């Protein structure tokens, strides 16, 4: 995954979700499928 994809902790489930600020997209589910 591109450098812009960070693994960041999400509020509700306490989950490690992938946040990307280059696309500004946010995926709890895996970006690569």
């Amino acid at each position: 995954l591109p450098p812009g994809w960070e693994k960041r902790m999400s509020r509700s489930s306490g989950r490690v979700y992938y946040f990307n600020h280059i696309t500004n997209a946010s995926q709890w589910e895996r970006p690569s499928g």
């Binding site: 999400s10 979700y17 946040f19 995926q27 709890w28 589910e29």
Partner: peptide, 8 residues
């Protein structure tokens, strides 16, 4: 405050 809905 910024928390995502899951794509599934």
């Amino acid at each position: 405050r910024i928390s995502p809905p899951l794509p599934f």
